[PDB]
Design a binder for this molecule. Structure first.
Ligand SMILES: Cc1cccc(NCc2ccccc2)n1
Ligand SMILES: Cc1cccc(NCc2ccccc2)n1
Ligand SMILES: [Zn+2]
Ligand SMILES: [Zn+2]
Ligand SMILES: [Zn+2]
Ligand SMILES: [Zn+2]
Lengths: 357, 357
């Protein structure tokens, strides 16, 4: 089974990386153990949606393509290594993001940097190692693969788009015209940049490229099946599902219980450009807008309670329903278009959509 | 002239990166301006020793190799782009290191993260962008180059070795047997791991690979001259000069005036495994060792003054002279061995040595 194969490949890749640190990088057992625990704590515990999407895309093509048994095993092995590259890429960004944001918890566990024997000094560098390991993996396992050049080039572009997205996100509550490394940044007072287009730009770069585009395209690359698809449709369907995934995360930050979310939501206190803030500003009257402005982006629990009350009264449950109906139409339309060149890939996209919905 | 060509290529690469963010990444002018200032502040102002070493290696081979004028211009252009990849790699590590260490100044200027409109939240991500740009550069300028695969593989290994070196450095004042993400780390009381071999391991990985090995080997790769050299001699001579460079930096941290160094030295307060600490422990009597242990690794200015007094009394100026004489012998021996296959490359190493000495 796919998940078992995927998890087995983690153990193999970890053993490879730690053995190489011992044989070629002069590491001692206690530092190898620290890095083993760092890898496990930062990479394991999720649903492995991203890595498993690579495997699932590859499995779809194996069911319709003629291959020797050893070739099927090799493609599935490459899809697992590729999937782990994405999981380690996410681990890098979550470690660095939690430090940047001074976050307390990540999926019911303390953030890595908060571990007593870690600290920010080590955690910033541990995050750097996590992304370096993605490349060590690719060069070792894919050294003689025809897709190596395309895989590394795609991975690099996605990594860069993600860092750009993080920049869009951390500066989302600043007035663009005031951005200056020499001047301390005040939070916006007009919220003029809390627009659907600006929200969509943050999400496309910060989340969509690494969460949806990269796993789908990597699955195609390891299967040598990129010519079987229209790349513009893959990008368009990735943009759409990715946006919907973030809208769900934004809604959950404010309304889902902390024990179910895995953290206490701080989007309101952090003055985040969330779907809730953008949608509320898109329908509120002048008095509700003024009340939002006097309470948004402050740690004060009573001020946070006014925002949570304004959202509940705004009936954003109805806007979400209308948004969801529109996404369903467009996702289904793109899935139909994907069937022209690849009914197999279209099914893998339908699975990805079902898992998000 | 080489330096002018190098600096001109910076302007061209910056224009390329910022234009691409506008054309393909949906950036707005104020964020493009922030990134332009970030690039300038973090990448410019040094001596460009690393980047210029690539150019100098390439220039050596151009004087002895038959090429059309356009090919000479292309090789020099590639050597400049390659040199900037190394300068941006260093910029990434200095930005992240200053955050990790809570440093105040870097070469007479405040550390990037301290800029009022930057903060740690942005600076950690800016550092990430600096290293992503190294790859954007390589894929754009070297897309059809025969050396692309070897250049990216080398660059990745060096980047990884550097992150491992940072791990060796930040944990250098911990007892290895006590390293544990679950337990807050006490500083060593025995200083048993302050040995020449352990010091050499920190320096080889944290500094030597990116400062000496990478610029020399990149100069060979852009010149298609790697087969003209014995790679083991290049690594050995890089290890030696790199170690000597760090010993100089360590001595300067304690004895050189802050205005000349470009910062107030904190190695003593930070309990760093410096050449001074290792050499002092290698010759001190039982009473001097006990006095060192009661004063090392504490912010207290009076305690720092005891360590500075112990070093001055230990006559470490004599150990440095004997160390320097030994390095001169071995560096000259390796330069002689390099003359067998490449007198041109041996001269480039002699220049690198002269610039360090
Ligand atoms: C593996 C694991 C999970 C949960 C907690 C834990 N260690 C205690 C801790 C770590 C960081 C901050 C607070 C408490 N370890
Ligand atoms: C470009 C440049 C150089 C020196 C100082 C400066 N800005 C003021 C500042 C920045 C950070 C910390 C303290 C003071 N800008
Ligand atoms: Zn964040
Ligand atoms: Zn969220
Ligand atoms: Zn440091
Ligand atoms: Zn130093």
């Amino acid at each position: 089974a796919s998940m078992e194969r995927f998890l087995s490949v983690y153990d193999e890749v970890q053993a490879f990386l730690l053995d190489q640190l011992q044989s070629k990088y002069e590491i001692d057992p206690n530092r190898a153990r620290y890095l083993r625990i760092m890898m496990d704590t930062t990479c394991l515990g999720g649903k492995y949606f991203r890595g498993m999407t690579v495997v699932n895309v590859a499995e779809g093509f194996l069911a319709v393509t003629q291959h020797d048994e050893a070739t099927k095993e090799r493609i599935l092995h490459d899809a697992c290594v590729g999937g782990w590259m994405i999981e380690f890429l996410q681990a890098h960004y979550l470690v660095e993001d939690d430090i940047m944001d001074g976050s307390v918890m990540r999926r019911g566990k303390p953030c890595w940097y908060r571990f007593p024997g870690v600290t920010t000094q080590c955690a910033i560098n541990d995050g750097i190692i996590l992304k370096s390991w993605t490349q060590i993996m690719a060069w070792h396992y894919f050294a003689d693969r025809p897709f190596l050049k395309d895989l590394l080039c795609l991975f690099q572009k996605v990594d860069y788009a993600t860092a750009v997205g993080q920049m869009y996100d951390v500066t989302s509550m600043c007035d663009s015209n005031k951005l200056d490394p020499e001047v301390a940044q005040p939070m916006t007072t007009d919220f003029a940049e809390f627009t659907p287009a600006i929200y969509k730009r943050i999400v496309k770069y910060k989340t969509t490229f690494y969460t949806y585009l990269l796993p789908l395209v990597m699955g195609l690359l390891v299967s040598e099946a990129a010519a079987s698809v229209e790349m513009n449709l893959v990008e368009r369907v990735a943009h759409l599902i990715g946006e919907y995934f973030q809208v769900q995360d934004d809604v959950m930050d404010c309304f889902t219980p902390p024990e179910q979310l895995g953290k206490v939501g701080t989007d309101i206190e952090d003055a985040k450009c969330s779907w809730l803030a953008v949608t509320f500003l898109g329908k509120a009257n002048a008095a509700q807008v003024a009340e939002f402005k006097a309470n948004y982006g402050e740690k004060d629990p009573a001020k946070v309670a006014v925002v949570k009350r304004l959202y509940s009264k705004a009936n954003l449950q109805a806007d979400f329903a209308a948004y969801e109906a529109e996404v369903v139409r467009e996702v289904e339309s793109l899935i139909e278009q994907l069937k022209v060149k690849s009914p197999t890939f279209a099914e893998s996209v339908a699975v990805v959509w079902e898992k998000t919905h």
